[PDB]
Design a protein around this ligand. Sequence first.
Ligand SMILES: [Zn+2]
Length: 203
Amino acid sequence: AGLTYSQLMTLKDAMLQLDPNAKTWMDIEGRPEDPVEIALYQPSSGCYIHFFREPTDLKQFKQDAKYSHGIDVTDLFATQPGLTSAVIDALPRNMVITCQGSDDIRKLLESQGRKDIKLIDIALSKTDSRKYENAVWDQYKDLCHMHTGVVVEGGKEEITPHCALMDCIMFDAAVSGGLNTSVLRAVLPRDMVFRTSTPRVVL
Ligand SMILES: [Zn+2]
């Protein structure tokens, strides 16, 4: 199980475009023991890691889908199992990672054998952290089309779906005074995030 040797080498060569000394946000969707969306974001350089994973616990996923990320589980079948472990293995040693609520990132990293990675815990309230939520989506929505379901928050209220990548961007904007100017560039090749499939032709 996991990535093949040549895949790991391509991933390692890929991870070199990460600046190991720059500020790096990280966030996930899904529980740290069963994540389905992973994102790292370096605002100063614009480099970001973004990929997806099929969940193990389908029951807990449906709750996360209805209260948080709104991802269709069928859109994750094409992801490669083991990408999350391989990427976490490939993060630079003694890296400093920033997050809004460091508890979940810590469990994920520690359970993957990366206790060397230090975490900066930014503690913004749940409305303070999403101040730039609309502005972030308005500029970067083309970077993730995976949040297709209706997300909701006694009484129900429909909300904007949570995206691990958009969270990293809007959290950094909240502590920096606005959106960054650095164009965003993906660290991971697209062929590594999803297995390409030709859609069925309508005859
Ligand atoms: Zn997303």
